[PDB]
A paper describes a structure:
Ribose-phosphate diphosphokinases or PRPP synthetases (EC 2.7.6.1, also called ribose-phosphate pyrophosphokinases) are a family of enzymes that catalyze the synthesis of PRPP from ATP and ribose-5-phosphate (R5P), yielding AMP as an additional product. The E. coli ribose-phosphate pyrophosphokinase (EcKPRS) is a class I PRPP synthetase with well-defined kinetics. As observed in other members of this protein family, EcKPRS has two α/β/α-sandwich domains related by two-fold pseudo-symmetry. The propeller-shaped homohexameric structure of KPRS is composed of a trimer of dimers, with the C-terminal domains forming the dimeric blades of the propeller and the N-terminal domains forming the hexameric core.
Here, we report the X-ray crystal structure of EcKPRS, determined to 2.2 Å resolution. The space group was C2221 and there were three molecules in the asymmetric unit with a solvent content of 46% (Matthews number = 2.28). The overall quaternary structure of EcKPRS, as observed in the crystal structure (composed of the 3 molecules in the asymmetric unit and 3 symmetry related molecules), predicted by the PISA Server, and confirmed by size exclusion chromatography (data not shown), is a hexamer. Note that, in two of the three chains in the unit cell, a loop region spanning residues 196–203 is unstructured and could not be modeled. The corresponding region in the third chain (chain C in the EcKPRS structure), however, had clearly defined density and was well modeled. Each active site, which accommodates the substrates AMP and R5P, is composed of residues from two chains of the hexamer. The purine ring is sandwiched between a phenylalanine residue (F35) from one chain and an arginine (R96) from a second chain. In the EcKPRS structure, a region of electron density consistent with a phosphate ion, was found to occupy the site believed to bind the phosphate of the R5P substrate, based upon superposition of EcKPRS with the B. subtilis and human PRPP synthetase structures. In the structure of EcKPRS the loop containing Arg102-Arg105 occupies the space where the ADP molecule is purported to bind and an ion (modeled as chloride in EcKPRS) is located in place of where the β-phosphate would be. The observed position of the loop also suggests that this part of the structure can occupy the allosteric binding site in place of the native ligand.
Residue numbers in the entry:
A (entry chain B), D (entry chain B): 3 to 195, 204 to 313
B (entry chain C), C (entry chain C): 3 to 313
E (entry chain A), F (entry chain A): 2 to 195, 204 to 314
């Protein structure tokens, strides 16, 4: 039967998922030795079990990654029946290619190899930076989108003739998809050369959208440029709240009226102390995905 | 010793490359048995050689792919020193994911595995449909761009205040890159919408194209339907002349007729895929060779020189 | 739950098999994109199912093979419980070695690796050109023989003191096996020689065939040239009637004309490969179904019953 | 540069090969611990070297196999540049399929996997029982034929109108190939039901040929049946002298005028004491193959 | 229910004892030799979808017994076995587990692990591996069961006089210490070559020599002599694996060892079976319980006590 | 000639010392972090066809330093490096090398070996592996160099008074015995928890505590106290790997240890660097020579003496 475990990356999210599945997070001791080496022991019988591990590979990335892979190795050596890595936010996803044959690692592929090597049978994740990461594995990878929940929220805002806009050139595809869903509305595009805005945003509510928010620098400069060109209100929507570096002060001194993110990464206390940062939960979506996977039901029929 | 072999996919491109490397193509019998099974025999000693196979996996895709993987296997079992697959056009590249967990293959990855399995040590290709395909392999994958050569030709046209245009949302990154290099001009974008069955597909133009030559640029042209509708929409919004540039001339289905009946002043493509007879009969379709780029890339690989320097 | 899917290689055989298993073929869209790339989508839930794909890798070989491996990949990524490739005719089986270290591929092994790589859990096939192909895989490979069905039909002819004949040296083991089962009759062998350019190929007959019906038996017929010359030689040595039996009707090249112009009284083949229109027009070519054998083999695999019992 | 080593299977053959290559067998201690476990130590620097190991997997098969695989593992872990297994007689070659889905191992494939696993880069062997064994490896496999040397011998016999004959049904292909080479002469075929002889052998010299001779039982019964049907002289030719079981007494009480075999397996003293058993050496052929492999010269051009 | 047991010729008696404790007949695998000495294996029963356990130590003759095991696995895998567990009470080649000073030798324990993984072993069950780290030479689960509880139970029934537990060499000190703790927290002695020097008060006491295995018996016999030279009362030698190679029979027969007590992971030769001072314990209870737990997906942790 | 050295942030000073002894500049790998803490690696020089050595212990912070190493290897492999040798003086996670009593834990040493093999390491060079058998966790060559000759040379220059070599616990007895033999065939003492009990005559003698590594220092400090309680003269503690986690600085600062002598496979914190009773030896000579030999295809066996 089904068993859930969680590491130390997203335990609050993990509990929410467990509650919606009417079950609990099983007993695994996930900690550290004195020297900082990860320590894992599975304190339950998992023989022949259908195991799900809930763990984003978010900050601290390499520790949380190592927690996940050694949990998998422990479970596999303990004769787990099936092991699914539920990785709401998949870290290193941005390292997915070698532009101009630059001598960089393709770290997303490396992580996929690592997970495959320790015996992951399946991956469940939310809004991969690049969908092609599905092809970095042999095993099934289910990449569920956060947009159904983000959209539902955008709809409850009563936007005066909203235009959707991608903060940079690499997010245009995602912005367009959101524009389609938001009553087939217009899209603008920001092109840095100074930030040139391609599209008519004067007198309109603007929905800035991306897959993730990191330092918030580009997002903040974009929101400024939008209002410098006559935008009314500016909302920032993303799935993954990375919020590294000086993100909290960037958003606090920004022009953005509200920031809406999902809960694939926990928020720091500084970010929780901001009045205009709101959280939406994917616990319902992930719980349902988990249920369907456990019960051999179609996942296709949930997008 | 460097040795070049070609299959039947791109033999004229292969020949050009060999010419530019001041060499000749090696003796390999690449054909068919009576029943359509691929027949390969390498008719020279390749032991310890630095071998490059020049084969796009273009139409007919499955025969050309099989010729490739089978050539690799024969070379490997005959103790080739190193095997580089030069695949100017990498077929199946569009099958690179499972959107909404649709029960579809990721064939681009399957092809990568197949090449890896028979012992390809390196891949050289031009303008992969998705760069992430580099990550579908363990081995080095160099993904060169045709855009420098396309650009060289764009400059030779002397355009009236040209604007670069991406025919769809996926080509935007490339369009900008070219806008920058094309005398730091500006860019426009095609936003295709068709939300309802009773409403016609509209091709929205994000940007101002009125009274300006338009350079439509993309990685490939397949049936040309999007491209022709993009062209039409540009003219209706007041664009002067419309030029279409792309690397891969796939031109399947009704492409020749679509172009013939289009408002496109000229279509300029690279030679990663040989042109059909239907396409060769069009007056306004012109071809640029990447045999220069690929010869140098190959030269650098064999001499252990930096490939980064090529971008 | 057991589920059967078919590609476009052997859809009528697939249908027969489904009928005999009292089921229907699953919903899978197996086609092409405009450019000739294989397009597959599995249009039902296969999660945890016991899946069998029915596809010979017959002509066009490379398209049919690619359909197969791509179907497997889509099923695997969609969490099929188990995937069995039912490949009645296994193409590329003749490319199974490198004679004299000739610089050729061992494509039969390459195909095996490809199937393994995409996650085939088992292979079911009929009369592999070489049984050793079983060893080209890790997974279980069941190699069933068509000869029981061919034999059933041979017995229905009532022959005048029949002698079983292997059309070449490779079919001798099978010919004997059949000689034994065909009322423990005797056997003869065709020893083809052509040592010199100025001498005609002679087809030596080892054994006495005078005043006897001859049953030419083989695993396959391709162009039929050997078979027709074998037939002619038998008659010239005094054989009465000549019947030709084989499992795989490949019939490439000029096979139809070769048979039409032959002295062969009747040619009887199994349905592992669909017949060409050219062949269907011949009065003396007849077809036997293995859909009974393959349905039972599949039934046994899914119920975990002994396959050994099937020989 | 090139280095040769040998195990304890075919050291005399190995020395002959080494002599013809104007080199020597390098220092490897190949022996046993007290309990019978194989003991290997390579007593030379092999770093970056082009290594050839000479070792048939003949009786005792599993010991000689283990000697070979652990020699390879020792050499690989010691950073050998390239490792070629020269395996004149490839044992377990007869276990190459599962007839009627019999629940037997395909041991030939298993051995190939084992050799591949320890890091063999290439295999050189003589007259594989089944040529398809080339396809059991990823790596190059060169299967040289003994027939050029066997034929050269047959030619020096002045055979009165020789007929070539395969002792059983499974050797017909090989007999025919020999018949072609022996001035395109006739072939007969033995069919056990009593042994039926298909072909006219009355008043003719008979050349019984196979890839190997094991107990000699079938070979002896065949030679008898040939003379019972009026054959003049009967010669037995094979590449691999296995000579297991009661082979020596079988041949001694047989009708065979002479037995001619190659040196891919050493002869027992009982077999050496027979007046009508002669040996031909493949040391020249194997040395030449080794030389060509070492020098990146065509092997194709030696068949 | 879907469980089936098979066995090769390495440990037939042990295999039968295990089978008896699981109330299960041994499967029909015709494991023999062709005339030339090549292994012959045929499985004469349906194993499709089964949970299959093969009982075969890789003891002398090592290479033959290893090959039986691996070809048995291959035949079973190609015959569509559901799961395959290699039960290898004594794991041969375990001592070849490293390259000391980068000596040009094989890591044959790893080579064997690779071989077993390659032919499709899904898990390994084994007793007192020479090195525990051999668990890491596999990807698959490896259960390394200890003989110590059985050996300890026997020790406790001897009614020894103030026993001292002692290692035959410096290499066995860790185990000896552990068995000393378990044996009513008694004392430990240590044997160190310097002649053999005994570190500890052995005078007047029953001594218990302990090790994972006994090979030729040479060191063990000297150890026993030295102990009695220092006034030891009785000397017992407890070990798991009775390798007994070379001159072991004479060594034990001429020793001052009161009793050698070994487990049944390697069959005894007739000669050593005759020795009055050599006694065997069976692990068939332990191994049968482990198999039953693996079969029914119960905890293996509970096997250690 | 085709040799190039790179290094991450784990052991920069050691890497530089190795580089200096090979008269070779360290290659330009920009090894850093993005804003979020993800490893950032770019190789800013041609490495095509090169013989590449990466110098990176997987010491604290372990997971960051391991990830630097593996992504460095991947970047180099995809950039067409000819050969890649991971030089990992201290190999982290080496203690997680087994599953005792089938405990549901990872064999993380093996997981790391797999990871390194997967990204394309062609060989590993390392110093005093916690378990030698970790050599068998790889398919590729693994050279496990010993610190002992450097540590022994230092010991011999102290001009000790009738030194006795001693293990801090039962687990280090084998090494202690080996170093006793090398140290002019001197005596050995053993420390056994029973309070700590010293087995041996330490009275009036300089004692040399020896181990492969020092972590918190707790056991080492008690060991030193017990030795002096039994009349030891001076107590030195020699080890290879200075892990020094937890409260190591206070433990050493408050010890009765005259000198702690460690090798430079893990950099020292500023606090421990300040301690007057803590001294480092360098292995850069040894590792540089090993690399030079690997590079020129010379015997490594000669490195052990
Ligand atoms: Cl480069
Ligand atoms: Cl069966
Ligand atoms: Cl457990
Ligand atoms: Cl060396």
């Amino acid at each position: 039967d089904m068993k859930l475990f969680a590491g130390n990356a997203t335990p609050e999210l993990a509990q929410r998922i467990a509650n919606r599945l009417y079950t609990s997070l099983g007993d695994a001791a996930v900690g550290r030795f004195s020297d900082g080496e990860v320590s894992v022991q599975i304190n339950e019988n998992v023989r022949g079990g259908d195991i799900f591990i809930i763990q984003s590979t978010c900050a601290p990335t390499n520790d949380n990654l190592m927690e996940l892979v050694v949990m998998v190795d422990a479970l596999r050596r303990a004769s787990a029946g099936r092991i699914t890595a539920v990785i709401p936010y998949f870290g290193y996803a941005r390292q997915d290619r070698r532009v101009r044959s630059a001598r960089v690692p393709i770290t997303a592929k490396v992580v996929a190899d690592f997970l495959s090597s320790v015996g992951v049978d399946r991956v469940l994740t939310v809004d991969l930076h690049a969908e092609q990461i599905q092809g970095f594995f042999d095993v099934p990878v289910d990449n569920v989108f956060g947009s159904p929940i983000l959209l539902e929220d955008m709809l409850q805002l009563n936007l005066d003739n909203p235009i959707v806009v991608s903060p940079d050139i690499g997010g245009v595809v995602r912005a367009r998809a959101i524009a389609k869903l938001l009553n087939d509305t217009d899209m603008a595009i920001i092109d840095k050369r100074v930030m040139h805005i391609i599209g008519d945003v004067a007198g309109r509510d603007c929905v800035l959208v991306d897959d993730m928010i990191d330092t918030g620098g580009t997002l903040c400069k974009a929101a400024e440029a939008l209002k410098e060109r006559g935008a009314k209100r500016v909302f920032a929507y993303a799935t993954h709240p990375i919020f590294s570096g000086n993100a909290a002060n960037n958003l606090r001194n920004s022009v953005i009226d509200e920031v809406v993110v999902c809960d694939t990464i926990p928020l720091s206390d500084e970010i929780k102390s901001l009045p205009n940062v709101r959280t939406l939960t994917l616990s319902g979506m992930l719980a349902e995905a988990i249920r369907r996977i456990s019960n051999e039901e179609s996942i296709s029929a949930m997008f």
